[PDB]
Amino acid sequence: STYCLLSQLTDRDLTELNECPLDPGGYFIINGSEKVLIAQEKMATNTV
DNA sequence: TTTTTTTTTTTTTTTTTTTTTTTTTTTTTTTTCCTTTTTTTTTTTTTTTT
């Protein structure tokens, strides 16, 4: 994301940090476990 | 002065509504997270005074 340390880094800079350049991200790291948030459907508010 | 005839008062059912309650295939394999917590009372400690 914008506020993480891996923002707009090159492939060499990501490889020097032992991170995969093909890793899409999009997940949190909570207690060392990779957690992903599933989008939830809901009815559209303020609609008749 | 007694009999019929109207009124009353229960009596049992009816019918519809509401409430309640109980149920939701079989087996198997992996992770993850939690298995307290702030509040109030009690006890000890530290500083101050005569």
Swiss-Prot record:
Cellular compartment(s): Nucleus
Positions of transmembrane segments: none
Quaternary data: Component of the RNA polymerase II (Pol II) complex consisting of 12 subunits.
Similarity field: Belongs to the RNA polymerase beta chain family.
Other remarks on this protein: The binding of ribonucleoside triphosphate to the RNA polymerase II transcribing complex probably involves a two-step mechanism. The initial binding seems to occur at the entry (E) site and involves a magnesium ion coordinated by three conserved aspartate residues of the two largest RNA Pol II subunits.
Function of the protein: DNA-dependent RNA polymerase catalyzes the transcription of DNA into RNA using the four ribonucleoside triphosphates as substrates. Second largest component of RNA polymerase II which synthesizes mRNA precursors and many functional non-coding RNAs. Proposed to contribute to the polymerase catalytic activity and forms the polymerase active center together with the largest subunit. Pol II is the central component of the basal RNA polymerase II transcription machinery. It is composed of mobile elements that move relative to each other.
Designated name of the protein: DNA-directed RNA polymerase II subunit RPB2
Organism taxonomic ancestry: Eukaryota, Metazoa, Ecdysozoa, Arthropoda, Hexapoda
Full protein: residues contained: 159 to 206 of 1176
